[PDB]
Structures are given as structure tokens and as C-alpha cells.
């Protein structure tokens, strides 16, 4: 990930991330709403980061160093380029919404008064149809992908070595091949929990409460549709 964005979301909360003097000029409800918006962008930044580890570090590496069939790496990391493009674009919109909010003359101080609209466009229309179709494909191939990794690690020493080599950096402690596949599967269920907590502290404007309510309904609808179209493969 880019040094600029890691530094921007390095703090454990929005109240810690902004300047202490800037925070002093805000209501508790604004700080509480902001912290959950900050967490949404933070965890979405970590999500795209996870997806880049799968495509550049694991998938690209297996094609380059291991000289392995493109069908096996496809069965190991299914739809990861599509998932990386869907979520990177979403992260870019969340990151630019934060940049517009920035006070003139500062890079840390911001307040996001509108989020709901952004969430609605992501969870409605062809962006949502792309997500339903891709996550239904990923969660079906998830079980086959976990069996495919184990058979390769406990059969071929070249792969056994590649895995140990690329997962040696301290940062990839919780991001091995298997943990990435689960982190991605678990990501979609985190949105209704995140949007629900933002909505809890967003009644100061009515159109924002109605935007976040419609986005919340859309994520739950997306999830219910993905769940229905899941068939486990072997």
C-alpha cells in the first residue's frame, strides 16, 4: 500500500487521527459518527491491501517463480483481479470523499458530512450486480481453493518453499494464502454492521439518515442474494 494512505489511516480512531485542537471544536455525536466512518475507510483500505497480497504476492509469484499451470493458480485465487478492481475503485471513492472534507491547510483534519450517497451508488446498479455475481463465484470456489492449496503445499516442495519464502515478512503473519481467502469471504458481512453504527449517530440531517438507511437495505439485499447463490464445489 501507498505510504500516504497508510499514514492517513495509521491511527486507531478518527479522534486520534485528527489534530487534538481540531477535535476540541466538535460535538460528541459528530466524533462518534466520524470514528465509524474512519473505521469503514480503514478496514476497506486493509481489504484492498489483502487483495493486492493475493494478486501480486501470491498469484503473480506462482506464475513467475514456480512456473505452474494458469488453471491451478486460477483455482487457488479465483476472481481476485475482478475483486481487486471492484474494491480498489470503491476505496478510491471513499479516499477522495475524505480529501474533499479536508480543512484548507491541513492533511489530517476532516469531517465527512455525506457518506450515504457514495454507499448507495456502490450497492445499487451494475456495481452491485458485479459484486453479487463475483462474491457468489468466490464463495463457491472458496472451499475448492482451500483443498487445492493444502494438496500443493503437502506434495510439492517447490510450492512448500515458495509459501514459506513469501509469507516470511512479519506483516504477512495474519495474511497467509488461507487467511486471505477467509478475510475476503468475511468482508461483505462487515458492511451492514459498519453502516448500522454510522446510521446510529447520523440523525442531524434527514436526507443523510434516509441515504444510509437505503444503503443498509441494499447491502443486506446484496448479502441475501450472494448467500442464496452459493453452492459448495470440490
Amino acid at each position: 500500500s501507498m505510504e500516504m494512505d497508510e499514514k492517513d489511516f495509521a491511527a486507531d480512531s478518527w479522534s486520534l487521527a485528527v489534530d487534538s485542537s481540531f477535535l476540541q471544536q466538535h460535538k460528541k455525536e459528530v466524533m462518534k459518527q466520524q470514528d465509524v466512518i474512519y473505521e469503514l475507510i480503514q478496514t476497506e483500505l486493509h481489504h484492498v491491501r489483502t487483495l493486492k497480497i493475493m494478486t501480486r504476492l501470491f498469484r503473480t509469484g506462482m506464475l513467475e517463480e514456480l512456473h505452474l499451470e494458469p488453471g491451478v493458480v486460477q483455482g487457488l485465487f479465483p476472481c481476485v483481479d475482478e475483486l481487486s478492481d471492484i474494491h480498489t475503485r470503491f476505496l478510491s471513492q471513499l479516499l477522495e470523499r475524505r480529501r474533499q472534507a479536508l480543512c484548507p491547510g491541513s492533511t489530517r483534519n476532516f469531517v465527512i458530512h455525506r457518506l450515504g450517497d457514495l454507499l448507495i451508488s456502490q450497492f445499487s446498479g451494475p456495481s452491485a450486480e458485479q459484486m453479487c455475481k463475483t462474491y457468489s463465484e468466490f464463495c463457491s470456489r472458496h472451499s475448492k481453493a482451500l483443498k487445492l492449496y493444502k494438496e500443493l503445499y503437502a506434495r510439492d516442495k517447490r510450492f512448500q518453499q515458495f509459501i514459506r519464502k513469501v509469507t516470511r515478512p512479519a506483516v504477512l503473519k495474519r495474511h497467509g494464502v488461507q487467511e486471505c481467502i477467509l478475510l475476503v469471504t468475511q468482508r461483505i458481512t462487515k458492511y451492514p454492521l459498519l453502516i448500522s453504527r454510522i446510521l446510529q449517530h447520523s440523525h442531524g440531517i434527514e436526507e443523510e439518515r434516509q441515504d444510509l438507511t437505503t444503503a443498509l437495505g441494499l447491502v443486506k439485499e446484496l448479502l441475501s442474494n450472494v448467500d442464496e447463490g452459493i453452492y459448495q464445489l470440490e
Binding site: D12, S13, W14, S15, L16, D35, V36, E39, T43, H46, C139, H142, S143, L146, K173, R174, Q178, E179, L182, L183, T185, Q186, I188, T189, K190, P192, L193, L194, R197, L223, S224, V226, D227, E228, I230
Partner: protein, 178 residues
């Protein structure tokens, strides 16, 4: 060091996310309590054994019965969480979470964890439960349930005060290693 996977199950009432966050941070969140939990890999030394313990939550997955079982593969220990201020959450242990957990993972040690023990002497909880013709979960009920469900053990803790939290994750590590 040997890696072991942990999954926590139970209704949202108990505070699965809270127990996982309090343990991984090893302090009750001061300024902000995080809404969600990703994953974590905690190095624990239990009885001279260096073990990498991967921590996973099932929060959000409660309504999605086809998406939730994808969290279970290769689990070495299941924390079966319930709330001491919610006797209804305990009633879901034998009828909802035990059949599902034993289906996907039949020989995985289950540790019935009664979280929110501090609320046993919180008069706002005793007062609200009196309206529902109920009272906080007694220690003997949580033990009776763990015995009925055939759990490896019964444990109690307070995510709010960190009391018992560490002992649960060390026993989870003992259970996984067997």
C-alpha cells in the same frame, strides 16, 4: 511455531467481537471500541508450548446460513459464547449453534464461555430481566448447559473488566493442542 485456528460462535448479544478485541489488544479499548474484527495471530506460551493462535469472529454471519459455514474449515477450537444477562442466548446454544458446529466440525473441542459476568451484580440488568419473568444466568446453569452439550469445558469472563479473558484463550490453546 504450531498454528491453531480459533472460531467464536454465538448470538450478537454475548459480545464476541468485544471479547476478541479486548484479548488481542490486552486492554479494554479506551478512546474507541472497534465495530468490526478482521483476524489476529496471537503467540501464546501455555505450559511451555509456543503456539500461534489465529483468532476469527463469526459476527455479521448470523443471518447467512450458507456463508457462515465457510468460516469453519480446519478449526482447532470453538469458543461457544453466550451472555449472562441474556438467558435467551443460552437457549440458542443447544437448539441452534451446537447442531451446526457439530455438523461441520464433529470432533472439535467446544468451550462454552459465559461472557458478561459483571452484569450479575448490575441492578439495571436484574431490573430489566424481572420484566421478562427472568434473571441473570446462574453459574450452575452455564455448567449444566456445557454438560448437556458435551463441551470440553465451561468458562466465565467479563469483556468489560478483562477478568477471565486471558484464562479462556489459554484454555482454548490447551483444547486445540490435544
Amino acid at each position: 511455531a504450531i498454528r491453531k485456528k480459533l472460531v467464536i460462535v454465538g448470538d450478537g448479544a454475548c459480545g464476541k467481537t468485544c471479547l476478541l478485541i479486548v484479548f488481542s489488544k490486552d486492554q479494554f479499548p479506551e478512546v474507541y471500541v472497534p465495530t468490526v474484527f478482521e483476524n489476529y495471530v496471537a503467540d501464546i506460551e501455555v505450559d511451555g508450548k509456543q503456539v500461534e493462535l489465529a483468532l476469527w469472529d463469526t459476527a455479521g454471519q448470523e443471518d447467512y446460513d450458507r456463508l457462515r459455514p465457510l468460516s469453519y474449515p480446519d478449526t482447532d477450537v470453538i469458543l461457544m459464547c453466550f451472555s449472562i444477562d441474556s438467558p435467551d442466548s443460552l437457549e440458542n446454544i443447544p437448539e441452534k449453534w451446537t447442531p451446526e458446529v457439530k455438523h461441520f466440525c464433529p470432533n472439535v473441542p467446544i468451550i462454552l464461555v459465559g461472557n458478561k459476568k459483571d452484569l450479575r451484580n448490575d441492578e439495571h440488568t436484574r431490573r430489566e430481566l424481572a420484566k421478562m419473568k427472568q434473571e441473570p444466568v446462574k453459574p450452575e446453569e452455564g455448567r449444566d448447559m456445557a454438560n448437556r452439550i458435551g463441551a470440553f469445558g465451561y468458562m466465565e469472563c467479563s469483556a468489560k473488566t478483562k477478568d477471565g479473558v486471558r484464562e479462556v484463550f489459554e484454555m482454548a490453546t490447551r483444547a486445540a493442542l490435544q
